[PDB]
Amino acid sequence: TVKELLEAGVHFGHERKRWNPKFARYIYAERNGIHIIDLQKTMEELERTFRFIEDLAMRGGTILFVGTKKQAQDIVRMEAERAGMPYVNQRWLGGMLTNFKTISQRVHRLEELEALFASPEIEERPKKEQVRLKHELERLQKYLSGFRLLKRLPDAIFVVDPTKEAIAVREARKLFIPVIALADTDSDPDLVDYIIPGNDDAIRSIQLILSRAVDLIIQARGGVVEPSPSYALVQ
RNA sequence: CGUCGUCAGCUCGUGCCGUGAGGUGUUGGGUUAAGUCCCGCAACGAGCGCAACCCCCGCCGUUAGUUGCCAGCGGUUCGG
Ligand SMILES: [K+]
Ligand SMILES: [K+]
Ligand SMILES: [Mg+2]
Ligand SMILES: [Mg+2]
Ligand SMILES: [Mg+2]
Ligand SMILES: [Mg+2]
Ligand SMILES: [Mg+2]
Ligand SMILES: [Mg+2]
Ligand SMILES: [Mg+2]
Ligand SMILES: [Mg+2]
Ligand SMILES: [Mg+2]
Ligand SMILES: [Mg+2]
Ligand SMILES: [Mg+2]
């Protein structure tokens, strides 16, 4: 909530090419063939976006964090492992929202296999199944790590790169789900309901935005939490 | 019942794409006897198949000696 001047490394966008003309309104200028985000409109949209986030959080809503860009995976896996908003980390499976019932059946199988490895039934039906179900539970935890927390459809989704996660965005549009996204110059802002015009490649931009967002979430429900332990992920 | 053919296939449910017939999944890369498995993927699963569970042949044990052996000894018309 104090990120006015601390926006160090967020204004850097993509190159001159690989952009989207619809993003031109959120661009300040072009320095050395690189689009730089308008610093004013950034906070201008941040006001409305964070206000919507606070309203949805203090009402008890659930937000789905989607990140697959390989530069926000380790960040999303813990910023959502904070206040219980679920997340999708390894890859976004087609139909997670429109076919939510089948993926929930997969989650049922996940917790079923978790119950089997908690019961003494591990030794019966010998080692063949003890390896098959082991690998099955492994990949289920690999893909449904954060998704298992969704009992129903989410009330909003959070995206790190709406161009890389365009399928999740489209599915959210189909179900009238609000779309919060950290957009860059390579994305279409019309599809995003609450835009955050920042950088999606840098680690500090993602860490800053997501850390402050989860801090706002926990602040809306009281009990301000300590600073997130995602700084050590700078590496 | 024969046949393609023990050939590796044929489909469904939901989602997604297309005005629609349909497509996706079932394509792809690695692998296998195999749609076998792995990785990737707008797909996620499932059914009939594949394989497995059945039988026979291979090694060993337990249980049991009207089949077997001077393995072990005695008798022997010396033929367990
Ligand atoms: K067309
Ligand atoms: K193949
Ligand atoms: Mg065969
Ligand atoms: Mg279909
Ligand atoms: Mg056509
Ligand atoms: Mg249609
Ligand atoms: Mg079909
Ligand atoms: Mg087909
Ligand atoms: Mg095909
Ligand atoms: Mg199969
Ligand atoms: Mg596939
Ligand atoms: Mg007899
Ligand atoms: Mg006998």
UniProtKB/Swiss-Prot annotation:
Q: Which residues form a coiled coil?
A: 99-144
Name of one Pfam family that matches: Ribosomal_S2
Q: Return the InterPro entries for the record.
A: Ribosomal_uS2 (IPR001865), Ribosomal_uS2_bac/mit/plastid (IPR005706), Ribosomal_uS2_CS (IPR018130), Ribosomal_uS2_flav_dom_sf (IPR023591)
Q: Does the keyword Coiled coil apply?
A: yes
What is a GO molecular function of this protein?
Answer: rRNA binding
For whether the record's keyword set contains RNA-binding, the answer is yes
Q: Which GO terms describe its cellular component?
A: cytosolic small ribosomal subunit
- What S-S linkages are listed for this chain? none
Q: Name one GO biological process term.
A: translation
Which top-rank group of organisms is this from?
Bacteria
Keywords (alphabetical) are: Coiled coil, Ribonucleoprotein, Ribosomal protein, RNA-binding, rRNA-binding
Query: What does the function comment of this entry state?
Result: Spans the head-body hinge region of the 30S subunit. Is loosely associated with the 30S subunit.
Write out the similarity annotation.
Answer: Belongs to the universal ribosomal protein uS2 family.
According to the record's subunit comment, the protein's assembly and interactions are: Part of the 30S ribosomal subunit. Contacts protein S8 and may contact the N-terminus of Era.
Task: From the Swiss-Prot or TrEMBL record, give the protein name.
Answer: Small ribosomal subunit protein uS2
| Species assigned in the record | Thermus thermophilus (strain ATCC 27634 / DSM 579 / HB8)
